[PDB]
Amino acid sequence: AECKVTVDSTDQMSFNTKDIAIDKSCKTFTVELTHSGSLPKNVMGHNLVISKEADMQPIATDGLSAGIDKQYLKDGDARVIAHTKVIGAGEKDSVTFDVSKLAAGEKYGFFCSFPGHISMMKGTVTLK
Amino acid sequence: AECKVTVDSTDQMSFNTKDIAIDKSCKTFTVELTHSGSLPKNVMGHNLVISKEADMQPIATDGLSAGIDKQYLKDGDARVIAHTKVIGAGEKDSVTFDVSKLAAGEKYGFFCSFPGHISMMKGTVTLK
Ligand SMILES: [Cu+2]
Ligand SMILES: [Cu+2]
Ligand SMILES: [Zn+2]
Ligand SMILES: [Zn+2]
Ligand SMILES: [Zn+2]
Ligand SMILES: [Zn+2]
């Protein structure tokens, strides 16, 4: 199986994809996030966070007050299945998680939790 | 006296001035803000906020939770002297305030409180 994907994020507040396909055959899956462009992380930082589709906005709202030091995520948030750091231009991060965590028949999505980015920066996770 | 100034804001996350000079003789001062370029407000929205220089970042941090519907400013934040709405490309807005609110000898600045913009979008307010 192919159990890795790389997603780019930009100065114009977008990801380069709207769906991440995860082979159910995979034991673990690795998401690598890169940031093209020139803006630093405190201006236009992006992370990639995976959760239940219905949990994305609640997580993002709870992340606002956490600050960039905690990757704009509330510490110990149980709704977060996996997430990268907040990265700025020229940086990259990756996260590897157990594919078992994704309940078949449940709807999953990815988003950026930097304040206000979720409106433009989200997508679906599809198990294949 | 001249008691009005126009400031433009860009897709490049910049104001087209670094200083706003306010004549002390003015009873009121009016700041008009425009937005050139083509990006919508949820991507590259800008407002213009006036406060004490030391207060700019705390105000901006507090504004994160207020959201774009509240112009990214906490309601009733007493540290805010004056502010425009958040505007997107092709829009404009203006604010008029009493110049007596400026204490000569105190240092004032202007900035944009849209998430992440402040480090790239701020300047001084100079009384003349
Ligand atoms: Cu982002
Ligand atoms: Cu701005
Ligand atoms: Zn909560
Ligand atoms: Zn974490
Ligand atoms: Zn004068
Ligand atoms: Zn107000």
UniProtKB/Swiss-Prot annotation, chains A, B:
GO MF annotation list: copper ion binding; electron transfer activity
Subcellular location: Periplasm
Entry keywords, A to Z: Copper, Disulfide bond, Electron transport, Metal-binding, Periplasm, Transport
GO cellular component terms listed in the entry, alphabetical order: periplasmic space
Pfam family, one: Copper-bind
Source organism, top-level taxon: Bacteria
Disulfide-bonded cysteines: C3-C26
Annotated Plastocyanin-like domain residues: 1-128
Binding site for Cu cation: H46, C112, H117, M121
Keyword Cell cycle included in the entry's annotation: no
InterPro entries for this protein: Azurin, BlueCu_1, BlueCu_1_BS, Cu-binding_ET, Cupredoxin
Protein task: Transfers electrons from cytochrome c551 to cytochrome oxidase.
NCBIfam families: azurin (TIGR02695)
The protein's name in its UniProt record: Azurin
